[PDB]
Amino acid sequence: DPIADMISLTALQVLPTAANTEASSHRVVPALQAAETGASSNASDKNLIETRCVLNHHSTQETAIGNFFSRAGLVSIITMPTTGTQNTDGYVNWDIDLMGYAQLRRKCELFTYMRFDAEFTFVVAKPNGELVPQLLQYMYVPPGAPKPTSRDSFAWQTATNPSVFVKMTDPPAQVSVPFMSPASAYQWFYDGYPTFGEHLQANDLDYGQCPNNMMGTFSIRTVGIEKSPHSITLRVYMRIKHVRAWIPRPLRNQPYLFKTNPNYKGNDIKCTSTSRDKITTL
């Protein structure tokens, strides 16, 4: 008491259908905007022209981020060939990174942060699309859990990790996954480094790598002591569900080159829009 110096405006609204149009006539300066402020023109039809009444029942439900994202998309293709350089071992460990396929990636990168649960579907077959009576095991190996070093590895005992056993002939396996980041949300962009220290050019592959997005390894194998005679192709589809998103940003307008960064082909910088001869001719 003996010292006197020690004593968000915007909100939501539910709009199920597009706004309507009201009538007006031959009649305050609402046509000229001060776009220098960083605001979008609040001028509508009724201001610049004479209008009729239109009872607009067009629905806005399909543009809800949920209907936009909750569509299963390809995020990975894993192959286990029998003859070659890949894995004549009968098993494969895949670091989880969903940024290897553009269609989905570009959609997510529309936002800076995203939080959601997901439905993963596992479509498996031979490289030509044929199916055979082969038993498989998919296992989720969280960060810290021991990764299988072979098709015989004890890790396939899967006493605590979650594993799925399914035949290549059964329908696609399918499961639900919760929001697992240790942060409040996954983030497609992390303008920083994961650790302290000097950031010499040798460790610049560190830039942009966010541990909170690193969900571990996904392992798969044929279930047998002996090698399987079949080459295997596994396509993993992901369907986002129960999603929330923050901070929209410009959409990628240059082809993707790498999973972990926004590097672009500097010699061939594509223009966002097609070109024409003259500004006065279509």
Ligand X SMILES: CCCCCCCCCCCCC/C=C\[C@H](O)[C@H](N)CO
Please identify, among the stretches 5-13, 85-93, 96-104, 269-277, the one whose residues bind ligand X according to the rule CB under 6 A: 96-104
For position 175 contacting ligand X by CB under 6 A, the verdict is yes
Looking at residues 3 to 22 of the shown chain, list those that interact with its own copies (rule: CB under 8 A).
3-5
Provide, rounded to whole angstroms, the least separation between the CB of residue 135 and its own copies: 14
158 binds, among its own copies, ligand X, Cl ion, none (CB under 5 to 8 A by kind): its own copies
- By the 8 A CB rule, do 176 and 118 touch? yes
SS3 248: strand
Q: H or E segment at 85?
A: none
- By the 8 A CB rule, do 191 and 172 touch? no
66 binds, among ligand X, its own copies, Cl ion, none (CB under 5 to 8 A by kind): Cl ion
Burial readout 103-121 (b: 16 or more C-beta within 10 A, e: otherwise): ebbebbbbbbebbbebebe
Please identify which residue in 156, 189, 207, 264 interacts with Cl ion, judged by CB under 5 A: 156
Tokens in use for 147? Answer: 């990764």
Distance CA 181, CA 79 (A): 27
Looking at residues 201 to 230 of the shown chain, list those that interact with its own copies (rule: CB under 8 A).
none
- The single-letter code of the amino acid at 279 is I
Tokens in use for 27? Answer: 């009649």
Matching residue, tokens 């439900």: 61
Q: 243 Cβ partners below 8 Å, 6+ apart?
A: 65, 66, 69, 70, 114, 115, 116
213 binds, among Cl ion, ligand X, its own copies, none (CB under 5 to 8 A by kind): ligand X
SS3 165: strand
For position 158 contacting its own copies by CB under 8 A, the verdict is yes
For position 259 contacting its own copies by CB under 8 A, the verdict is no
For position 123 contacting ligand X by CB under 6 A, the verdict is no
For position 145 contacting ligand X by CB under 6 A, the verdict is no
SS3 251: coil
DSSP designation for 171: -
Provide, rounded to whole angstroms, the least separation between the CB of residue 156 and Cl ion: 4
3 binds, among its own copies, Cl ion, ligand X, none (CB under 5 to 8 A by kind): its own copies
Provide, rounded to whole angstroms, the least separation between the CB of residue 148 and Cl ion: 10
Please identify, among the stretches 63-71, 166-174, 227-235, 258-266, the one whose residues bind Cl ion according to the rule CB under 5 A: 63-71
List residues near ligand X by CB under 6 A. Answer: 96-99, 118, 120, 138, 140, 162, 164, 175, 177, 180, 186, 213-215, 218
List residues near Cl ion by CB under 5 A. Answer: 66, 156, 241-243
